[PDB]
Structure formats: structure tokens, C-alpha cells
Amino acid sequence: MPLDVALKRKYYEEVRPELIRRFGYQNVWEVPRLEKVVINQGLGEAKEDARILEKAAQELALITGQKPAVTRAKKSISNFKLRKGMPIGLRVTLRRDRMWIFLEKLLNVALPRIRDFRGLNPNSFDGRGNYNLGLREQLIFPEITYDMVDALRGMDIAVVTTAETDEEARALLELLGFPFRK
């Protein structure tokens, strides 16, 4: 555990200067590093309120620190254009290091893990070189067992990077955490 902690620490610390000058030649800047990572998941309407809301709890929890209560369908998805406020903001905006043992554990230690979990995804982030890819099925047992039949699945996170333009960002998490195929 703190094992893979020291791990990401190194992966990146070195890889960084590595490609850093390999191609950069700017001034070893965020050319192209990664900072803070928010994570978001399958909106409250995915609710049952008490039940799967508390499950969202368990999960958000053991995953990175924060676990769901009972309120996930207000101003309701209702019928099509039928919705009011937005009291279903269930996400983790944790900011740094924790995040890195995470890049670790998460990408590099749980990446392929369950049903054909391959990863042959085109322009992963591409929306400015900052993230993109959230997976559509939990890291199954990134911990816990049957603590809810359907429990959870709509999973998707995002990193705040500086890997500016893509090709660059690409160098970045490509060698840093694995670039899923063509």
C-alpha cells in the first residue's frame, strides 16, 4: 500500500525529467505534469435514497475518503424536461498526493481488472490534455465484496493537468500510467 505510494512517487518523479528534456527544452516545467484530481460518479437519480445512496457512501469512502447519505432524486429527472435545483452533487475533489498514490493504485494497479478490461480507447483526454476516461464499471473489489448487488458502476474521474496540448499530455500519462491502444 504505502508501497505503491513510494511507487507513483518515483514513476513520475523520474519519468518527468526523463521525457521532460527528452523533448521539452523549455525549463523542466509542467511540460507536462499532472495536478489534483476530482472524481465524479453516476448521479443521485441513480438513487433508491437510503439504500444505493448509502452504497455510494461505502464506495466514495474506501475509494478515496468521502461516503454518501440519503437524497438522490430532487427536482427529479422526472419526465424529460422536468427538473429543478440540483441536490445531487456527489464527487471527490481531493487535491494532491493522496491523488498520486491514486494515479498509482487506480491506473497502474487496477486498470485491467474485470470483464475484458482491456483498454483500446482513442484520444483519451484530448480535451486539452487534462484527463478523460472514467470506466463504466467499478474496480470491482478495489476493496469490498457484496455490499450491494448492483451497488455501483457509473464511475468516472478527471485530473487537473498542465500537460497542455495533447501529443504532450500523451507523453505524460502515456508512459506515466499507460496509454490504452490506438
Backbone angles phi, psi at 162, to 5 degrees: -125, 10
Residues 31-70 that bind RNA (CB under 7 A): 36, 38, 40-46, 65-66
Is 169 near RNA (CB under 7 A)? no
**Radius of gyration for the alpha carbons in the chain, expressed in angstroms and rounded:** 18
Among 80, 115, 116, 149, binds RNA (CB under 7 A): 80
71 binds RNA, rule: CB under 7 A: no
Q: Give Cβ neighbours of residue 46 (< 8 Å, ≥ 6 apart).
A: 52, 56, 72, 154
Burial group, residue 171, by CB count within 10 angstroms (0-12, 13-18, 19+):
buried
CB 146 within 8 A of CB 20: no
How many residues comprise the chain?
182
- Asked if 123 interacts with RNA (CB under 7 A), we say yes
Judged by CB under 7 A, which of 34, 53, 63, 92 binds RNA? 92
Q: Does 142 participate in binding RNA (rule CB under 7 A)?
A: no
Rounded Cα–Cα distance for residues 92 and 99 (Å): 10
As measured in angstroms, the least distance from the Cβ of 118 to RNA is 14
**Position of cell 498509482?**
104
Does position 131 interact with RNA (CB under 7 A)? The reply is yes
Pick the piece of the chain touching RNA (CB under 7 A) from 107-115, 126-134, 139-147, 170-178: 126-134
Which residues here bind RNA, judged by CB under 7 A? Answer: 26-27, 29-30, 36, 38, 40-46, 65-66, 77, 80-81, 83, 86, 88-96, 121, 123-128, 130-137, 153-156, 158, 160
